[PDB]
Design a protein around this ligand. Structure first.
Ligand SMILES: O=P(O)(O)C(Nc1ncnc2sc(-c3ccc(C4CC4)cc3)cc12)P(=O)(O)O
Ligand SMILES: O=P(O)(O)C(Nc1ncnc2sc(-c3ccc(C4CC4)cc3)cc12)P(=O)(O)O
Ligand SMILES: [Mg+2]
Ligand SMILES: [Mg+2]
Ligand SMILES: [Mg+2]
Ligand SMILES: [Mg+2]
Ligand SMILES: [Mg+2]
Ligand SMILES: [Mg+2]
Lengths: 346, 346
């Protein structure tokens, strides 16, 4: 919508970002090779996704600054903060792929699986985290919102690592306990691991950039953007199994990795004592046969139909939340975002 | 010296730090388990080292604030920033151990080698990075230096990741090229990977905390503290091979991991065309026999004697740098630190 409009401009700005993060060798030639490697990391890991999050920073900026106040530089900065959220993303993915033993991301092989990278990936990832704050310094240093943004990113990082910790504690390798896999636990997980950084972070960054720094303006926004995030991670769990790797750009692992996926939580609730045992006996194991038994059992309970039911009822519920809590913000900010993820298949 | 004096107080402050980083569940019970895991990570990975860096923050604080201005809270904050540098350290180690395929750290098994952790270590590490900025917020939020410290830590993180990148690019697995292993390259590596965060970071943090924020006061300090860092990493490379694992708390890997160690750089400079080939043929391989051939060749060139020569001449050179550049800072700040690392064997 407004998103599809703004992409080409956002994506072309990536070159400047890179010309800029590699202007550090235009003062220190002894680190050339490290900069080269950094470029490479960026090229491979910052590109090829949908860019929802970065664009959401820029769309929300249009919609919250009076166009008088949108000078050339105001925009350029917003492109950057936009990119700053894409770096956050990049950093999480490079490292969640190692942790999740994934094979492919955005329709290429995962950075760590590349010949000659492996676990150097862990540095690569953190360099990407670093680059955020180097951009904030280089573009927003003189702005009233600087500190708010720095605290926002870090703060959001921390909540997201917290969420990752639960994702992992709840899904221990070679230990199939399913007592653990509940509704309450699921909600907590996705709240922390996905919702703060994929949905609040980028909107609030746009709000901070427009001088809207009020506690209650952020609290309301959050009530909306968090439930939106929950829904989005459920989408993500559905696609892990039922998506198209031609389209999602990634092969699934929730079952192999013994994950507290939305799927498995719904399964337990419906399964017969009989069926519980197929699951127990096939879940969280690297064997194709056992994975398949679980997919089938999921299809046996017409869980893709329950997905579609839930996706309709949550989208409504979210719309209720926009009616209740958007004010004084243009509903469009939240709607544009909602449209871009409802009935999504990539 | 002043260090040995201040430790007991610094180490006891670790409990408060933990009671404080786990007071987040005193608002959000749904993340208990993640906090538990965080405690555990901290306990295992923040403890057992020398604490040079953290103590150096606190020693330098004594020596730069007029004792009138050292109220209870002023100290407590300095303990924290001190601990903030130990968290930085913790985070780098947890993850450098994975990247370096190390077995033991501070005389226990490396966190990632623990049964039931493995590559979840990558999250664990980043949680430790997070905790720094959560402490800065919770203790130094209202201070004039806050932003300076935040930029200092991040900035220092970034330079250290840059340095890590070179460490790794220069030491590719299963690819023994020794053209790469030069003096110039070595200096660059250790400058970035060790010196900024182990030596500048903690002193400058103490300076920022004492309102000494002048460009030239930090530049001079840096000239000193960077050369000090170089020397310290050379020490670290010597101990990798020639130390006592009973004492260093860690088993070495520079040879196996094909590292641009101070040792190997000195070796090349001295070796006969004959000897160059033993090295080429045994370096960077996981085989005990081949490692041993290299150790022996190193002992063949009386490199431990060259170490002791260099350690004397650099310590002198550093002392010259303190005579030249300490002012207006108490020489003690730099000397206390120098004494604590000269002729060091752990
Ligand atoms: O691999 P995906 O793309 O399905 C997905 N990736 C994510 N989706 C939503 N939120 C998050 S947070 C996250 C992540 C990555 C790394 C870390 C730690 C290094 C900090 C923490 C969180 C990955 C991720 P997940 O099913 O693995 O959760
Ligand atoms: O393992 P050690 O203790 O000998 C030593 N550890 C370090 N010593 C001095 N500086 C540094 S910087 C560093 C490190 C760790 C992790 C990272 C990336 C995750 C950020 C970057 C740098 C480890 C390290 P090294 O010989 O591996 O260099
Ligand atoms: Mg994951
Ligand atoms: Mg994953
Ligand atoms: Mg997923
Ligand atoms: Mg290393
Ligand atoms: Mg190491
Ligand atoms: Mg070492």
């Amino acid at each position: 919508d407004v998103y599809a409009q703004e992409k080409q401009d956002f994506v072309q700005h990536f070159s400047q970002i890179v010309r800029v993060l590699t202007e550090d060798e235009m003062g220190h030639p002894e680190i050339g090779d490290a900069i080269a490697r950094l470029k490479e990391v960026l090229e491979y890991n910052a590109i090829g996704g949908k860019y929802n999050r970065g664009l959401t920073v820029v769309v929300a900026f249009r919609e919250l600054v009076e166009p008088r106040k949108q000078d050339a530089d105001s925009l350029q900065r917003a492109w950057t903060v936009g990119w700053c959220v894409e770096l956050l993303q990049a950093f999480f993915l490079v490292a969640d792929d190692i942790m999740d033993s994934s094979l492919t991301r955005r329709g290429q092989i995962c950075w760590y699986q590349k010949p000659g990278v492996g676990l150097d990936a862990i540095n690569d990832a953190n360099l990407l985290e670093a680059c955020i704050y180097r951009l904030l310094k280089l573009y927003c240093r003189e702005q009233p919102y600087y500190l708010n943004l720095i605290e926002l990113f870090l703060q959001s990082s921390y909540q997201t690592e917290i969420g990752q910790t639960l994702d992992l504690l709840t899904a221990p390798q070679g230990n199939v306990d399913l007592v653990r896999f509940t509704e309450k636990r699921y909600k907590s997980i996705v709240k922390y691991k996905t919702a703060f950084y994929s949905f609040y972070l980028p909107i609030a960054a746009a709000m901070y950039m427009a001088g809207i720094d009020g506690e209650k303006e952020h609290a309301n926004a959050k009530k909306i953007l968090l439930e939106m995030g929950e829904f989005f991670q459920i989408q993500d769990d559905y696609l892990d199994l039922f998506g198209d790797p031609s389209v999602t750009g990634k092969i699934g692992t929730d079952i192999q990795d013994n994950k507290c996926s939305w799927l498995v939580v719904q399964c337990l609730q419906r399964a017969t004592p009989e069926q519980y045992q197929i699951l127990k006996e096939n879940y969280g194991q690297k064997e194709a046969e056992k994975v398949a038994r679980v997919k089938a059992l999921y299809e046996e309970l017409d869980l893709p139909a329950v997905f579609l039911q839930y996706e309709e009822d949550s989208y409504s519920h979210i719309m209720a939340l926009i009616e209740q809590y958007a004010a004084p913000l243009p509903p469009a900010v939240f709607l544009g975002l909602a449209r871009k993820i409802y009935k999504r298949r990539k």
